Amino acid sequence: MFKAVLFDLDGVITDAAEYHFRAWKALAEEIGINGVDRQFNEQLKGVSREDSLQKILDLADKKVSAEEFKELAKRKNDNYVKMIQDVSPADVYPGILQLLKDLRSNKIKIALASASKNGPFLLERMNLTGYFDAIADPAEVAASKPAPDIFIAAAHAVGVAPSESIGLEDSQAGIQAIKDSGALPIGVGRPEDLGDDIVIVPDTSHYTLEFLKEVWLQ
Numbered sequence: 753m754f755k756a757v758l759f760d761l762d763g764v765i766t767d768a769a770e771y772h773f774r775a776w777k778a779l780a781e782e783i784g785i786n787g788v789d790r791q792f793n794e795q796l797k798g799v800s801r802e803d804s805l806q807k808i809l810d811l812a813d814k815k816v817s818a819e820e821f822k823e824l825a826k827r828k829n830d831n832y833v834k835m836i837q838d839v840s841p842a843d844v845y846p847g848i849l850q851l852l853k854d855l856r857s858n859k860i861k862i863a864l865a866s867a868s869k870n871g872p873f874l875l876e877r878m879n880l881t882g883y884f885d886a887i888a889d890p891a892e893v894a895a896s897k898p899a900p901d902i903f904i905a906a907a908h909a910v911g912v913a914p915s916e917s918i919g920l921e922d923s924q925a926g927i928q929a930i931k932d933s934g935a936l937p938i939g940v941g942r943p944e945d946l947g948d949d950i951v952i953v954p955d956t957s958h959y960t961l962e963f964l965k966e967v968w969l970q
């Protein structure tokens with residue numbers, strides 16, 4: 753049986769993306785840039801803070817110095833951190849808590865494998881810290897998804913090889929990272945986005961221990 757589960761955060765454990773959207777919308781309102789809506793935000797998902805800012809500036813074909821860029825980036829960050837103070841246990845996606853309980857009950861290690869700079873804070877606000885054996889620090893990895901580094905680090909951090917692990921991800925780049933780590937990916941979303949050659953569930957309520965076991969056994 754697999755010895756660990758390696759969890760992406762956004763789109764697996766919770767909708768962290770929604771808070772990034774509101775922070776971006778709020779900054780854009782403050783500086784008078786139109787068009788930062790839910791559909792434009794589709795183009796910010798899995799994008800770095802700085803690239804996301806640039807795409808926002810591009811809505812107004814606006815030109816700013818390196819200092820101004822840094823300062824807008826800083827304000828969005830301030831915004832986001834202020835907004836996530838309201839994260840609570842009700843933000844945890846369906847089925848995830850139950851899965852973490854069942855994993856812990858079966859002594860299966862649990863690690864976070866997220867790019868989020870606020871991972872530990874977010875898990876604590878969702879009351880999930882006690883389930884996590886480790887959080888891979890994205891500041892300590894050389895390369896981001898789709899490179900497997902974060903997953904490798906998460907597995908190592910709980911004292912297993914990636915090959916003893918299942919990885920859960922909602923992104924195509926995250927799926928690649930899990931494959932290239934050696935661990936077994938199970939996506940959530942649609943095969944159109946994630947690939948056709950891996951097991952995929954439609955939503956997190958389908959991530960059960962029994963299902964993970966079946967997939968590992970198959």
Ligand code: ALF
Binds near residue numbers: 760761866868923
């Ligand atoms: F939390 Al993620 F890719 F959604 F690291």
Ligand SMILES: [Mg+2]
Binds near residue numbers: 921
């Ligand atoms: Mg994600």
